[PDB]
Design a protein around this ligand. Structure first.
Ligand SMILES: O=C(NO)c1cccc(C(=O)NO)c1
Ligand code: NA
Ligand code: NI
Ligand code: NI
Ligand code: NI
Ligand code: NI
Ligand code: NI
Ligand code: NI
Ligand code: NI
Ligand code: NI
Ligand code: NI
Ligand code: NI
Ligand code: NI
Lengths: 174, 174, 174, 174, 174, 174
């Protein structure tokens, strides 16, 4: 039955929100995984570790914000298993940043579709929500991961252990 | 003829804005009536009274900024009578909360139609204005009014005079 | 059913307070209309606009204190339509000052009749309420508007656009 | 191979830790779900929502500290799917508290087994890690949940909606 | 080649940002020119000069944020000559204000066309970027220049040198 | 005809100043281009980017000071097109530094000629202006650009991607 607050909220929108929530939780799990990889005693890049833990916590916020949205519009929250990440070993700082970059473009793609749907269903409140809270966040995150990938490459990563050490100190360590 | 500032601002949009101003002033008036209803010596719920007086002054502000937008775009303000509310006696705390929820959804619907007009006339400025200053304010009012209605019901209102009293104290009073 | 608080409160008085409520709300509306007339890109006198918006919120307070009075004596508030103002275009700073003067003398005339009624019904609390919160406010307001009208006339308004500009800057702007 | 730091760390412990990590993430997920149940417009108990959201974030911390422990001892983290919680709809404040109480005792169960493993493998660093950061935390949580359940039942929950409202305000609302 | 960050960014959009970049710099150049026209000893209106120098620096910021956008989305900046302004002598305060109004309406028109392109290529990030940072800024700037034009005209500009002097003091000089 | 302030100010000097204004605007433009080159996701050297953006805003100040000197002496400002820079793509940190040095030596050459023109025309006011505000600024910039080029070379640039990264961090990052 229909929530007392529901208005102009398409059940397709509601289902897409539930999928986005699962995708943000998944992204935060991937970042959690990347963070404790660089915490390993045989990798030991503390700033990669805390860079990725920070992203892990932001993705958890992203998801909670979609959960609040769902309830605000009178949709109903249906959670699904959070799939484990594709890797347990992320190989290098470089490779981790690249996998993060790919992850973010896939999150961005699902959000752009969410936005298209909201536009298509004449749900301007939801479109504006995706614009305000998610779209520029992806663009900034993707632009930053590219910069990082670019620098690690020009420095000689992953072959230069020096390059990853120094990028950990001078870029990811403030 | 036309204002020196007018640009990409359709006369249909100008008319809808004059319509929305009136509806916002109307909403203010309803909330004013509600507020002083709970100020009656035979109703005597100060925090209900305070809550709707606050929404009354908010709606007045909603109206004033639509008047500002009107002049900004070079449209022209035509005011209309402000219609008296549907009731002089709002019956109870629960009933007033329910009428308020109904009122906001009707205002929300008016705003969503205004937004699709702005997008049909390819007026991205007007569309963003509505997104930015109205759409999420309506979603929040509607979700809050929903929450209040739910709690007042679960508590035993409107039959239970104890329920409305305790809601007035513990939810609407800080 | 007579209110448990009602005492020495005549229904003529009760009815006349409801009329005065409506009249203050009307005065508020007129002032609102004048304010955004001067916000127009082709009128553009910011301190005229500010001045009348201030008067508008004052009149709203005037109306709210009368609704409070009604409930304090155990009368019952009945709201009526709020008529739109007489003009959509107010022509000039001078002309709006003069309509304000005339509006304020009309509200004063109604308040003097309200007070006459309270005294004829031996209602000294009501007469003192009107004396304390309304009569000198009107006299001050009428005196200020006449001062403003007088200076605008001597400066050459409304034919001198220079005059209305300089008045807006030096008298209505701090 | 074998990590340069590994010392007295049995592969059964390492694998028991990996399973605990998953169980803490699971517990986090359950609490997240409970939290936004109470945020629904038709449930609308915001301090229940606040309380479970805070437990959710605490369990994510339990999980991260185990991931740290694993790396400290030279184990290797292997994450698994995080299973979706057993309900989408938690029925009431009282039922949520009872479910949470059941969840915490099960987590307590797995930790005391984790701990008896550590004593048996003569891993005293691991046993005190469990003693110090988990065992008393679980006892406090189980006791607090017991107290809440006890109080909700005496107040008349889950049938008395008044009871859950007042418990939300006077216990969970600080 | 395609940038590693590019996603949902159409080459027409990329091309149109490059044009908008050039147009803002052009606008900044026009304002620079207007500003030092009022610095001339035979014009000598220092608040006119400060007013246009300020808009000049704002327009340069408009251009720089567009260059930032281009790189954020993976586009490539291509700069073009900056055309000199249409006049070397701007004639009067009023005439400069009117040229500024027409300039800002042209930049607005190009910005609306940029936004419609973003909408048509389903590029919600770019459209939101234009909504957020440019469209209301244009509307405010157009509205203000219109106000200034109106006040200069009512005061007797540009024949009244007294008028432009008094307007420079009381409106543009804080 | 002649400005009422003009004195000992040769028409050739007035024209040379108009030329120098353009060249300063040109220098500004080159540095702006360089700046956002290093802001590209595939270049990604923020301190290079910030460094040239700073020089860009300084050149703009250099230009405006000359526009002010022009009016101070009763000459008349004539703006010309600002020519786009010679490159859209500046290749590397070392190459941009070398271009910048070349640009500055060319600007210095223009200024030294402007100075000798001033001394040939017996304009001690113009000659001291160039001395006081440009000549040593040019020498300091040329010396500093020289120092940067030397270090990037000794470090292994532009081959070494590590070189430019470490320089960006330790020299241009304070
Ligand atoms: O310490 C123990 N319980 O407290 C314990 C448990 C299992 C085995 C052994 C053992 O091998 N003793 O020799 C000891
Ligand atoms: Na928007
Ligand atoms: Ni995200
Ligand atoms: Ni409203
Ligand atoms: Ni209480
Ligand atoms: Ni009044
Ligand atoms: Ni008498
Ligand atoms: Ni735990
Ligand atoms: Ni033992
Ligand atoms: Ni601009
Ligand atoms: Ni569309
Ligand atoms: Ni220079
Ligand atoms: Ni270093």
């Amino acid at each position: 039955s229909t929530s007392q607050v529901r208005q102009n909220y398409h059940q397709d929108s509601e289902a897409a929100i539930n999928r986005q929530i699962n995708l943000e939780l998944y992204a935060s799990y991937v970042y959690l995984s990347m963070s404790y990889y660089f915490d390993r005693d045989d990798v030991a890049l503390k700033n990669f570790a805390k860079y990725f833990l920070h992203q892990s916590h932001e993705e958890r916020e992203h998801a909670e914000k979609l959960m609040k949205l769902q309830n605000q519009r009178g949709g109903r929250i249906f959670l699904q298993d959070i799939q484990k990440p594709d890797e347990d070993d992320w190989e290098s700082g470089l490779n981790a940043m690249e996998a993060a970059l790919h992850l973010e473009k896939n999150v961005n793609q699902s959000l752009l579709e969410l936005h298209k749907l909201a536009h298509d269903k004449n749900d301007p409140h939801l479109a504006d929500f995706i614009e305000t809270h998610y779209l520029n966040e992806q663009v900034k995150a993707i632009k930053e991961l590219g910069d990082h990938v670019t620098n690690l490459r020009k420095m000689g990563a992953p072959e230069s252990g020096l390059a990853e050490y120094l990028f950990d100190k001078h870029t990811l360590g403030d």
